[PDB]
């Protein structure tokens, strides 16, 4: 979806560099590990800037884990997190660069919203769309749907992969649900509230088969139940604005076949979470079916509904938004560059003034 | 007497291990049986 | 001995003799023995019935107040006591003893009169 | 005197003894391993409560659900499942700094700071936080946030003076007459001085101990 600009490296690979041979820096690092010494950010930065070599990426990985297990594994640099995505993709590993981002607890890997469309702008362009996917599901896991132009490209994989797959599992729909719910809330157009109805409800499939733990247990969510309140919510809200807002059709018959579905079907951790006195979700679904129908009957009489499908409808949003998103994205990467710039020869500078003391104090020793 | 609210707060959090729920005491010493 | 740690305590140190039971009220470091070093005795417990029928309580009260007032923790003994006297409040579970004593006992009474409706049964029989 | 002499072996044991224990000192990722198929921790064979079964199982720690975040979760709220189910009022903590411990093969053992609230209340300053090894850690969501910490504080209800106790009251109303002072007042104890924090408030991890590094 993003143009050539927007995916161009010239102004990442002008970046001024110091040169280091890898063995030499490789070096450094291990005599440090041996003797349980710190090791600094400007070392493991180095080492990722002179990457030459598609062997070399996987040297890299190596140190990046030994640096994320180290003293000074906060200290990881926004701009060397930055570059290691680069160089992945410059010499084709970008297998290796989404195995690194899933396994972020183990190599450190938190990339900021431009890298995060970068990598998953590569996937889209390959049709990979099952790789592209794995990246949303890491966006939403970091809970980083912050820039405009993440989101854009976030729904057009969800609602792509979603008209591909018929049958979803119930780890699916709520992996599914909770990436639809956040990128959706984001946008108020009719594709962000469609996406919120259509996580919302997704998410009260599983509180209503499988409890309420199975859907915030590990997930950025909440451990409130009634998920299934919250998506007749929406369709309240949009019926009664004052505003004219639209929901897609699509959506809504999603939610009438959740309900349907569960109105009728067919070592020590068991504990009741809930309140005596609270009803029960179960209880209530009699209520929630004839607010349904109340709320789809308003709002087809105010004609707020959108035949046009949301793959349809997410592809004229991302066509008619995205290019000034990529304008505005493209501009702040360049201030980006540029402090990183200057915070990289910042820590230059520290390190020779320390090197010129330790002879001071070595004369004086 | 305990709100009913707090009653069922405590029936969750010693789920499994709880005793019959009692009542407001004898108002006074019931006289000793002979 | 050399106590390292500890606070000061006012408790009751038993005395007597076997089946005489008597408690002198002390003031003393908590990690010394029940019956030996004490700092000052605040009073006197006995708990045996006198020939008037009267459980008889000493307390030094002034003295009392003055530990108390230098962070003399007491134990749960010596504040029912205090409760019973009047100079503490009652202790809470004095209070719950005595609420699960009239529950048990109204539990006894209920039993003998449905006894007594069950015998009242054999009288209808003869 | 002067027949006591010193004691040289005393005075190389206790300083070499120390000496060791700086050297080994344990980690918390070994201090605080556990064995979820027995509950009971390795180093020492501590057998966990009962009660604490059910948690240890179903919930997680603070650094698992930190290590997963960028920037190890600064800036992030993060509540228990025991303050969930008893207090109404939001409890949380607002972390500040996080050293996770390095030697942990995923990150999942540390220190944390932050500021807390608790029942609807925020302290002035950032203390360390306790319980940080326990299973009962619940991060809160970023859209979730605003809704969680909205609190409204009601008119406090518990009486500020009370009565004083039957006898002490006597002796408070005899010594005025004692004295020449003539009034029907009540005595009366204040209470606002003297207010007692809930059990469960959070203590101070900084004045707290530390398991020793000899195992069992
Ligand atoms: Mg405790």
């Given at each position: 979806?993003?143009?050539?600009?927007?995916?161009?490296?010239?102004?990442?690979?002008?970046?001024?560099?110091?040169?280091?041979?890898?063995?030499?820096?490789?070096?450094?690092?291990?005599?440090?590990?041996?003797?349980?010494?710190?090791?600094?950010?400007?070392?493991?930065?180095?080492?990722?800037?002179?990457?030459?070599?598609?062997?070399?990426?996987?040297?890299?990985?190596?140190?990046?884990?030994?640096?994320?297990?180290?003293?000074?594994?906060?200290?990881?640099?926004?701009?060397?997190?930055?570059?290691?995505?680069?160089?992945?993709?410059?010499?084709?590993?970008?297998?290796?660069?989404?195995?690194?981002?899933?396994?972020?607890?183990?190599?450190?890997?938190?990339?900021?919203?431009?890298?995060?469309?970068?990598?998953?702008?590569?996937?889209?362009?390959?049709?990979?769309?099952?790789?592209?996917?794995?990246?949303?599901?890491?966006?939403?896991?970091?809970?980083?749907?912050?820039?405009?132009?993440?989101?854009?490209?976030?729904?057009?994989?969800?609602?792509?992969?979603?008209?591909?797959?018929?049958?979803?599992?119930?780890?699916?729909?709520?992996?599914?649900?909770?990436?639809?719910?956040?990128?959706?809330?984001?946008?108020?157009?009719?594709?962000?509230?469609?996406?919120?109805?259509?996580?919302?409800?997704?998410?009260?499939?599983?509180?209503?088969?499988?409890?309420?733990?199975?859907?915030?247990?590990?997930?950025?969510?909440?451990?409130?139940?009634?998920?299934?309140?919250?998506?007749?919510?929406?369709?309240?809200?949009?019926?009664?604005?004052?505003?004219?807002?639209?929901?897609?059709?699509?959506?809504?018959?999603?939610?009438?076949?959740?309900?349907?579905?569960?109105?009728?079907?067919?070592?020590?951790?068991?504990?009741?979470?809930?309140?005596?006195?609270?009803?029960?979700?179960?209880?209530?679904?009699?209520?929630?079916?004839?607010?349904?129908?109340?709320?789809?009957?308003?709002?087809?009489?105010?004609?707020?509904?959108?035949?046009?499908?949301?793959?349809?409808?997410?592809?004229?949003?991302?066509?008619?938004?995205?290019?000034?998103?990529?304008?505005?994205?493209?501009?702040?990467?360049?201030?980006?560059?540029?402090?990183?710039?200057?915070?990289?020869?910042?820590?230059?500078?520290?390190?020779?003034?320390?090197?010129?003391?330790?002879?001071?104090?070595?004369?004086?020793? | 007497?305990?709100?009913?609210?707090?009653?069922?707060?405590?029936?969750?959090?010693?789920?499994?291990?709880?005793?019959?729920?009692?009542?407001?005491?004898?108002?006074?010493?019931?006289?000793?049986?002979? | 001995?050399?106590?390292?740690?500890?606070?000061?305590?006012?408790?009751?140190?038993?005395?007597?003799?076997?089946?005489?039971?008597?408690?002198?009220?002390?003031?003393?470091?908590?990690?010394?023995?029940?019956?030996?070093?004490?700092?000052?005795?605040?009073?006197?417990?006995?708990?045996?019935?006198?020939?008037?029928?009267?459980?008889?309580?000493?307390?030094?009260?002034?003295?009392?107040?003055?530990?108390?007032?230098?962070?003399?923790?007491?134990?749960?003994?010596?504040?029912?006591?205090?409760?019973?006297?009047?100079?503490?409040?009652?202790?809470?579970?004095?209070?719950?003893?005595?609420?699960?004593?009239?529950?048990?006992?109204?539990?006894?009474?209920?039993?003998?009169?449905?006894?007594?409706?069950?015998?009242?049964?054999?009288?209808?029989?003869? | 005197?002067?027949?006591?002499?010193?004691?040289?072996?005393?005075?190389?044991?206790?300083?070499?003894?120390?000496?060791?224990?700086?050297?080994?000192?344990?980690?918390?990722?070994?201090?605080?391993?556990?064995?979820?198929?027995?509950?009971?921790?390795?180093?020492?064979?501590?057998?966990?409560?009962?009660?604490?079964?059910?948690?240890?199982?179903?919930?997680?720690?603070?650094?698992?659900?930190?290590?997963?975040?960028?920037?190890?979760?600064?800036?992030?709220?993060?509540?228990?499942?025991?303050?969930?189910?008893?207090?109404?009022?939001?409890?949380?903590w607002?972390?500040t700094r996080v050293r996770?411990?390095?030697?942990?093969?995923?990150?999942?053992?540390?220190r944390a700071w932050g500021?807390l609230?608790?029942?609807?209340?925020?302290?002035?300053?950032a203390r360390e936080i306790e319980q940080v090894?326990?299973?009962?850690?619940?991060?809160?969501?970023?859209?979730?946030?605003?809704?969680?910490?909205?609190?409204?504080?009601?008119?406090?209800?518990?009486?500020?003076?009370?009565?004083?106790?039957?006898?002490?009251?006597?002796?408070?109303?005899?010594?005025?007459?004692?004295?020449?002072?003539?009034?029907?007042?009540?005595?009366?104890?204040?209470?606002?001085?003297?207010?007692?924090?809930?059990?469960?408030?959070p203590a101070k991890q900084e004045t707290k101990?530390?398991?020793?590094?000899?195992?069992?």
């Amino acid at each position: 979806l993003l143009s050539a600009a927007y995916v161009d490296s010239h102004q990442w690979e002008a970046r001024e560099k110091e040169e280091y041979h890898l063995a030499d820096l490789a070096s450094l690092m291990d005599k440090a590990y041996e003797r349980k010494l710190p090791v600094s950010s400007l070392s493991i930065s180095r080492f990722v800037d002179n990457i030459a070599s598609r062997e070399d990426l996987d040297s890299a990985e190596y140190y990046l884990y030994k640096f994320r297990h180290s003293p000074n594994c906060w200290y990881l640099r926004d701009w060397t997190i930055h570059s290691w995505i680069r160089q992945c993709l410059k010499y084709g590993a970008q297998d290796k660069a989404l195995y690194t981002l899933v396994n972020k607890v183990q190599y450190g890997i938190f990339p900021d919203n431009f890298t995060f469309n970068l990598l998953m702008d590569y996937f889209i362009k390959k049709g990979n769309y099952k790789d592209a996917l794995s990246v949303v599901f890491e966006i939403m896991m970091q809970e980083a749907f912050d820039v405009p132009s993440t989101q854009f490209l976030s729904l057009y994989v969800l609602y792509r992969c979603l008209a591909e797959k018929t049958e979803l599992t119930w780890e699916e729909e709520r992996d599914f649900g909770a990436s639809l719910l956040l990128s959706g809330l984001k946008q108020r157009n009719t594709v962000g509230l469609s996406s919120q109805l259509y996580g919302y409800a997704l998410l009260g499939k599983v509180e209503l088969q499988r409890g309420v733990r199975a859907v915030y247990h590990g997930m950025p969510l909440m451990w409130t139940p009634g998920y299934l309140d919250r998506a007749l919510q929406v369709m309240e809200r949009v019926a009664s604005s004052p505003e004219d807002l639209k929901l897609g059709r699509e959506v809504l018959d999603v939610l009438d076949g959740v309900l349907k579905v569960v109105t009728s079907p067919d070592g020590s951790a068991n504990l009741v979470e809930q309140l005596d006195t609270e009803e029960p979700e179960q209880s209530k679904l009699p209520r929630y079916l004839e607010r349904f129908q109340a709320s789809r009957s308003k709002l087809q009489e105010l004609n707020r509904v959108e035949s046009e499908s949301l793959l349809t409808l997410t592809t004229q949003l991302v066509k008619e938004k995205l290019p000034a998103c990529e304008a505005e994205d493209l501009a702040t990467y360049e201030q980006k560059l540029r402090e990183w710039h200057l915070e990289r020869v910042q820590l230059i500078q520290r390190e020779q003034e320390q090197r010129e003391k330790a002879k001071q104090e070595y004369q004086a020793l | 007497q305990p709100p009913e609210r707090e009653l069922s707060r405590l029936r969750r959090l010693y789920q499994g291990n709880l005793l019959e729920e009692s009542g407001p005491p004898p108002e006074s010493m019931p006289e000793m049986p002979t | 001995k050399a106590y390292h740690g500890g606070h000061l305590t006012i408790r009751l140190a038993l005395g007597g003799c076997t089946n005489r039971p008597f408690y002198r009220i002390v003031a003393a470091h908590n990690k010394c023995p029940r019956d030996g070093r004490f700092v000052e005795q605040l009073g006197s417990y006995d708990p045996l019935p006198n020939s008037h029928g009267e459980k008889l309580v000493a307390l030094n009260l002034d003295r009392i107040r003055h530990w108390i007032g230098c962070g003399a923790h007491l134990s749960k003994p010596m504040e029912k006591l205090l409760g019973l006297s009047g100079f503490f409040p009652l202790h809470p579970m004095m209070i719950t003893n005595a609420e699960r004593l009239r529950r048990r006992r109204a539990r006894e009474v209920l039993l003998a009169s449905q006894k007594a409706e069950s015998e009242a049964k054999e009288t209808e029989a003869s | 005197r002067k027949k006591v002499r010193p004691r040289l072996i005393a005075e190389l044991a206790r300083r070499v003894r120390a000496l060791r224990e700086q050297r080994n000192q344990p980690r918390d990722s070994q201090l605080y391993a556990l064995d979820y198929e027995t509950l009971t921790r390795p180093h020492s064979g501590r057998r966990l409560p009962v009660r604490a079964w059910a948690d240890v199982r179903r919930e997680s720690r603070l650094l698992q659900l930190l290590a997963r975040l960028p920037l190890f979760g600064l800036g992030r709220l993060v509540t228990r499942k025991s303050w969930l189910w008893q207090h109404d009022e939001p409890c949380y903590w607002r972390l500040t700094r996080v050293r996770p411990d390095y030697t942990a093969q995923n990150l999942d053992h540390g220190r944390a700071w932050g500021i807390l609230t608790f029942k609807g209340k925020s302290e002035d300053t950032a203390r360390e936080i306790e319980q940080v090894m326990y299973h009962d850690w619940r991060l809160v969501p970023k859209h979730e946030e605003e809704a969680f910490t909205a609190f409204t504080a009601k008119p406090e209800d518990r009486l500020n003076s009370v009565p004083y106790p039957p006898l002490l009251r006597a002796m408070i109303l005899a010594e005025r007459q004692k004295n020449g002072d003539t009034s029907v007042q009540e005595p009366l104890l204040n209470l606002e001085r003297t207010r007692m924090r809930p059990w469960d408030y959070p203590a101070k991890q900084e004045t707290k101990g530390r398991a020793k590094g000899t195992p069992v």
